[PDB]
Design an enzyme around this catalytic site. Sequence first.
Site, PDB file in Angstrom:
ATOM      1  N   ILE A  86       0.850  -1.259   0.017  1.00 49.10           N
ATOM      2  CA  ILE A  86       0.056   0.054  -0.035  1.00 49.10           C
ATOM      3  C   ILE A  86       0.682   1.238   0.140  1.00 49.10           C
ATOM      4  O   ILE A  86       0.386   2.258  -0.071  1.00 49.10           O
ATOM      5  CB  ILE A  86      -0.954   0.026   1.318  1.00 49.10           C
ATOM      6  CG1 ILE A  86      -0.466  -0.059   2.507  1.00 49.10           C
ATOM      7  CG2 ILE A  86      -2.165  -1.191   0.942  1.00 49.10           C
ATOM      8  CD1 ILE A  86      -1.337   0.462   3.856  1.00 49.10           C
ATOM      9  N   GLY A  87       2.122   1.094   0.199  1.00 42.05           N
ATOM     10  CA  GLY A  87       3.053   2.185   0.405  1.00 42.05           C
ATOM     11  C   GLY A  87       4.536   1.879  -0.037  1.00 42.05           C
ATOM     12  O   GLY A  87       4.863   0.766  -0.064  1.00 42.05           O
ATOM     13  N   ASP A  97       8.979  17.815   7.930  1.00 35.60           N
ATOM     14  CA  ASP A  97       8.403  17.209   6.517  1.00 35.60           C
ATOM     15  C   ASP A  97       7.078  17.117   6.511  1.00 35.60           C
ATOM     16  O   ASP A  97       6.413  16.092   6.339  1.00 35.60           O
ATOM     17  CB  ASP A  97       9.467  15.664   6.247  1.00 35.60           C
ATOM     18  CG  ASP A  97       9.291  15.278   5.092  1.00 35.60           C
ATOM     19  OD1 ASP A  97       9.138  16.081   3.895  1.00 35.60           O
ATOM     20  OD2 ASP A  97       9.266  14.007   4.649  1.00 35.60           O
ATOM     21  N   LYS A 135       3.984  17.584   4.692  1.00 28.99           N
ATOM     22  CA  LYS A 135       3.349  17.368   3.191  1.00 28.99           C
ATOM     23  C   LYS A 135       2.089  16.427   3.230  1.00 28.99           C
ATOM     24  O   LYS A 135       2.107  15.720   4.003  1.00 28.99           O
ATOM     25  CB  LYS A 135       4.531  16.846   2.469  1.00 28.99           C
ATOM     26  CG  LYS A 135       5.274  15.646   2.798  1.00 28.99           C
ATOM     27  CD  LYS A 135       5.902  14.854   1.747  1.00 28.99           C
ATOM     28  CE  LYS A 135       6.525  13.732   2.302  1.00 28.99           C
ATOM     29  NZ  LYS A 135       7.240  12.914   1.210  1.00 28.99           N
ATOM     30  N   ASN A 140       2.364  12.475   3.961  1.00 24.81           N
ATOM     31  CA  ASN A 140       2.257  11.945   5.269  1.00 24.81           C
ATOM     32  C   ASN A 140       1.181  11.904   6.187  1.00 24.81           C
ATOM     33  O   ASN A 140       1.145  12.015   7.617  1.00 24.81           O
ATOM     34  CB  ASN A 140       3.626  12.758   5.890  1.00 24.81           C
ATOM     35  CG  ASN A 140       4.896  12.542   5.260  1.00 24.81           C
ATOM     36  OD1 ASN A 140       5.090  11.688   4.549  1.00 24.81           O
ATOM     37  ND2 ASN A 140       5.924  13.431   5.683  1.00 24.81           N
ATOM     38  N   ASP A 150       4.508   9.992   9.402  1.00 25.59           N
ATOM     39  CA  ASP A 150       5.871   9.837   9.221  1.00 25.59           C
ATOM     40  C   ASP A 150       6.513  10.887  10.078  1.00 25.59           C
ATOM     41  O   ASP A 150       6.200  12.163   9.893  1.00 25.59           O
ATOM     42  CB  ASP A 150       6.518  10.208   7.613  1.00 25.59           C
ATOM     43  CG  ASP A 150       7.686   9.374   7.249  1.00 25.59           C
ATOM     44  OD1 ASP A 150       8.568  10.177   7.544  1.00 25.59           O
ATOM     45  OD2 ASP A 150       7.534   8.246   6.656  1.00 25.59           O
ATOM     46  N   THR A 157      11.133  18.048   1.889  1.00 22.59           N
ATOM     47  CA  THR A 157      10.648  17.554   0.266  1.00 22.59           C
ATOM     48  C   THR A 157      10.858  18.906  -0.584  1.00 22.59           C
ATOM     49  O   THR A 157      10.596  19.850   0.037  1.00 22.59           O
ATOM     50  CB  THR A 157       9.136  16.933   0.284  1.00 22.59           C
ATOM     51  OG1 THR A 157       8.348  17.690   0.914  1.00 22.59           O
ATOM     52  CG2 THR A 157       9.271  15.367   0.573  1.00 22.59           C
TER      53      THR A 157
HETATM   54  C1  LIG Z   1       1.215   3.778   3.360  1.00 21.78           C
HETATM   55  C2  LIG Z   1       1.723   4.214   4.617  1.00 21.78           C
HETATM   56  C3  LIG Z   1       3.092   4.995   4.962  1.00 21.78           C
HETATM   57  C4  LIG Z   1       4.171   5.236   3.941  1.00 21.78           C
HETATM   58  O1  LIG Z   1       3.725   5.400   2.648  1.00 21.78           O
HETATM   59  N1  LIG Z   1       5.284   5.824   4.685  1.00 21.78           N
HETATM   60  C5  LIG Z   1       6.535   6.411   3.709  1.00 21.78           C
HETATM   61  C6  LIG Z   1       7.508   5.160   3.675  1.00 21.78           C
HETATM   62  C7  LIG Z   1       7.181   3.735   3.338  1.00 21.78           C
HETATM   63  C8  LIG Z   1       8.322   2.879   3.372  1.00 21.78           C
HETATM   64  C9  LIG Z   1       9.445   3.206   3.487  1.00 21.78           C
HETATM   65  C10 LIG Z   1       9.737   4.623   3.742  1.00 21.78           C
HETATM   66  C11 LIG Z   1      11.089   5.237   4.107  1.00 21.78           C
HETATM   67  O2  LIG Z   1      12.146   4.685   3.594  1.00 21.78           O
HETATM   68  N2  LIG Z   1      11.291   6.277   4.923  1.00 21.78           N
HETATM   69  C12 LIG Z   1      12.552   7.118   5.020  1.00 21.78           C
HETATM   70  N3  LIG Z   1      12.615   7.860   5.567  1.00 21.78           N
HETATM   71  C13 LIG Z   1      13.981   8.586   5.594  1.00 21.78           C
HETATM   72  C14 LIG Z   1      14.717   7.945   5.038  1.00 21.78           C
HETATM   73  S1  LIG Z   1      14.067   6.533   4.233  1.00 21.78           S
HETATM   74  C15 LIG Z   1      16.326   8.304   4.967  1.00 21.78           C
HETATM   75  N4  LIG Z   1      16.467   9.696   5.048  1.00 21.78           N
HETATM   76  C16 LIG Z   1      16.179  10.502   4.102  1.00 21.78           C
HETATM   77  C17 LIG Z   1      15.677  10.526   6.355  1.00 21.78           C
HETATM   78  C18 LIG Z   1      14.007   9.960   6.631  1.00 21.78           C
HETATM   79  C19 LIG Z   1       9.011   5.742   3.726  1.00 21.78           C
HETATM   80  N5  LIG Z   1       3.111   5.367   6.299  1.00 21.78           N
HETATM   81  N6  LIG Z   1       2.185   4.885   6.840  1.00 21.78           N
HETATM   82  N7  LIG Z   1       1.180   4.476   5.849  1.00 21.78           N
HETATM   83  C20 LIG Z   1      -0.035   3.581   6.289  1.00 21.78           C
HETATM   84  N8  LIG Z   1      -1.048   3.185   5.410  1.00 21.78           N
HETATM   85  O3  LIG Z   1      -2.074   2.947   6.103  1.00 21.78           O
HETATM   86  N9  LIG Z   1      -1.815   3.014   7.601  1.00 21.78           N
HETATM   87  C21 LIG Z   1      -0.578   3.497   7.775  1.00 21.78           C
HETATM   88  N10 LIG Z   1      -0.040   3.561   8.739  1.00 21.78           N
END
Ligand SMILES: Cc1c(C(=O)NCc2cccc(C(=O)Nc3nc4c(s3)CN(C)CC4)c2)nnn1-c1nonc1N
Lengths: 395, 358
Positions: free
Chosen positions: A76-77, A192, A194, A197, A210, A231
Amino acid sequence: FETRFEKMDNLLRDPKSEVNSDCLLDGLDALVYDLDFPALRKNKNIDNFLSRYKDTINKIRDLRMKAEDYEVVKVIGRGAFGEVQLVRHKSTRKVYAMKLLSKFEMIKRSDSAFFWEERDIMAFANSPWVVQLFYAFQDDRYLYMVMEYMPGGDLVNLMSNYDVPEKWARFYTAEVVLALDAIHSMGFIHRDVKPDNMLLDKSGHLKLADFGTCMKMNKEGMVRCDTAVGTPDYISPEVLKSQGGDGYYGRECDWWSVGVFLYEMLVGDTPFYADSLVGTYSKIMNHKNSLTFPDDNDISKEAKNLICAFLTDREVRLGRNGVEEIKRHLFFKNDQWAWETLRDTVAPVVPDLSSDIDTSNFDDLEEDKGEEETFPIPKAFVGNQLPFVGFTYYS
Amino acid sequence: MSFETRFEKMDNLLRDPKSEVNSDCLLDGLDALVYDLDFPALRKNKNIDNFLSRYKDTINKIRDLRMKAEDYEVVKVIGRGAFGEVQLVRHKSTRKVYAMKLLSKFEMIKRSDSAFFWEERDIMAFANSPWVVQLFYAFQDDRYLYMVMEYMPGGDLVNLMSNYDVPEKWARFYTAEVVLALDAIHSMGFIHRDVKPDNMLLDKSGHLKLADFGTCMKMNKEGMVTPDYISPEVLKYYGRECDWWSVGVFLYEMLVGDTPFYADSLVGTYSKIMNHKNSLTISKEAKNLICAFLVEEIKRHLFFKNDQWAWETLRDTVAPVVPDLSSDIDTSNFDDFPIPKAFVGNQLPFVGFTYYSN
Ligand SMILES: Cc1c(C(=O)NCc2cccc(C(=O)Nc3nc4c(s3)CN(C)CC4)c2)nnn1-c1nonc1N
Ligand SMILES: Cc1c(C(=O)NCc2cccc(C(=O)Nc3nc4c(s3)CN(C)CC4)c2)nnn1-c1nonc1N
C-alpha cells in the site's frame, strides 16, 4: 544492596529504556549475526561464544516476533529505503500497516539513525493526531514497524479524487495545525509536513504518519542543522539554505509547509512548482516575487491572507509568537466546528469500507522487483547490526 | 508456538536462573561488547563508534548498579590456586560473611583454559545439597570472574591430617561423607576426576562438603566420560569408578600419613600408579577397602560397619572435630592486557557467568 536494586529493576522493565529485555536480546542477536562467518570463526573466542549461544539464539528467533507471523495482503506504500504492506497477524487475526526499512540501504547511504525519533513518537505519543506503533522488530535484513492501519488513505489521494472546496480545506488545515502543535508540545520540529504523510482513519480524521525528519528542540525552541531535510516543494527558505555555520532555526519552518499545503489544496498546484528541481529552489528563495495566485479566483481574501502570512520570511511569519495567532486567523472563523472539539465533528470525507482489508483508498503498487541487495561476507568484524540494537518494541 | 503461548515460553527463558539468556546473562553480552569495542583503532568504524556513543554511558550506570568487588570488604586471603585466590569477604551492605574466589581472565585467555568454571557454576549454584559448597553470587569485571560462596570455617582435610593423628573411627566418618558427597555428584550426572583432601572442606559443625568442581564432566549418553589421586584409566572412555580410586588413595593417606604412590619425582608417581599391582605396599577391613578401590556395594563393606552412625543420618551425628570459633571472621583453621588493533573479543568466553540467587 538496597541503595541500588530499585533503580536497576526499573531499567529492565521500562519500555522507554535503552536496556530493557527486548533491547538486550537485540545485542546478543546482532552479535550472533555479525560474528557467524568462517573468517571470524578462526578466532577461538568468537568460535566458542557462537557454539555456546547460536543454538539458544535460534530458539529465541523462533519465539520472538518475526515477518512470518504476518500475512501480506497488499503493498500500500513505498519509500526510499522500503515499503508499507497491509498485513494480518496469523495468530491474533488483527489488521495492521507494516513498514519495512532496508538495513543494506541504511548502511550504504550512512542513514541509520533517522528512525529513533519516529519509534519514540509513534510508540509513546498517545495522541489522536499520531499514527500508533504497536510493535517494532527486526531480522538481519530489515527493520519492521507494525503500525495502525489508516483506511482513508493520504491527502494527496483525496486532492486527486476531489475538487476540494474551502470548507474542506479549512477542516484539514486546522487538523494539521492541531497535529503539528501536539508534535511541538512533545519537543519536536517535524521538518517534513506534506500531504503524503497526512493519513485519514475509518472516520475520516487526520493523523501524521511519518516522523523520519523529526528533531528535538532546545530550551529556546531551536535546532542547529547543517543538512537540509524535507521535500523539494514544501521546504522553507531557512531549512533549504542549511549548511555548516548557517542552519539555526525554530518550529516556524513547519508553518511555512502548512501555507504550501493550503495553497496546493485550493489551487491544485504547489506555489513554487517548476519543471526543474533547481527551478523550485530559485522560486522558494525568491518567494517575495514568485508567489502568485491564478487570475480565475474561487479562493477567498482571508484564505489568500493565511497563505501569504505563512509564505514569508521567518521573522514576519505567522506562528512566530505561538499557535494561538494561527488559530485566531479569520480563515478559520466558521459556525461548523470549534478548535477544542474539531476531531469529534463529522469529517468532509468518511471512508466507505466493505472489509477490514479494504484498500480502495490506496493506489496499486508493484510487489516483486526481482531481487534486492545484501551485505557482502565480512573478512573482519564490521558490526553492520550494531546501529539497530534496541529497535525492538512490543508493550 | 503460537501468540501468546510463545510469549509465555519467551518470558520463562528471561526469568529462569538456569537459562543461558536470562536478564543477567543478556547484560553480560552488552557489557562484554562495550569492553571489547572501546579502543581508538576499533572506534574508526562508524558502526562501532555510534553504538558506543549510544550505550557506553548507560552501561557505566549498569556497572555501578550491579554487583561489584567494591561491595565486599576483604578480611584475609584464605586460599590460592593456579588462576587466582580465595578471600574471606564481608558484604558492606548486608554485613554477611562469605568466601570469594577470583579467577584471572588474562590467565584463562593465555592458557586457552576458559570453560572449566561452567560445570562448577552449575553444580555450586543449583546442587541444593548439604554435600556441595553453595554459590550465592557469581559476577565479573574486565579482569576477573568472582564467585561468592559459603564460608567453611573448619578448613580443609589436609590441615586436619597435619594437626591430628587420625584414628580409624575418624577415617571411617570422613570416608563415608566423601562416598555420600560423590554419590550426590554422580546423581547430578557428573564425574569429579579430582577427589583430594584439599577440595574437602568442613563447616561450623565439622561436616564435610566438596568445594572444587573445576575438573567435573557430564556423563555422556548414559554415563561414560591433579596427581597423585589420579586413576590409571584417566592417566591413559571411562565411568564414575575413577572417583572411587581417589577415595582409596584418600583413605590410605589418612591411615598411613603418606600417599600410596608417593615419589620424590612426579614421573616416579606416574609409573607407581600404572604398576599399582606391585607398587601398593591398621585393621584388616580397612586394608581390604583400600585394595578394593585399587554405590550400595561400597556402603555394604565391613569397614563402614559401626555402632556410632547410620548412612541415612550420618550428617546429623556429631563430627570428630567441631571448630572452636571466636567470631564470624575466625580463620584459625586456615594457614597464611594488550590494546587490540582489531576485534579479538576477550570478554566473549565469560558472557553468561553472572548469577544472583533470589
Ligand atoms: C502507506 C503508509 C506510509 C508510507 O507510505 N510511508 C512512507 C514510507 C514507506 C516505506 C519506507 C519509507 C522510508 O524509506 N522512509 C525513510 N525516511 C527517511 C529515510 S528513508 C532516509 N532519510 C532521507 C531520512 C528519513 C517511507 N506510512 N504509513 N502508511 C499507512 N497506510 O495505512 N496506515 C498506515 N500507517
Ligand atoms: C579456600 C577455598 C577454596 C580453594 O582453595 N580453591 C582453590 C582455588 C582458589 C583460587 C583459584 C583456583 C583456581 O584457579 N582453580 C582452577 N581450576 C582449574 C583451573 S584454574 C584450570 N584447569 C586446569 C581446570 C581446573 C582454585 N575453595 N573453596 N574455599 C573455601 N573456603 O571457605 N569456603 C570456601 N568455599
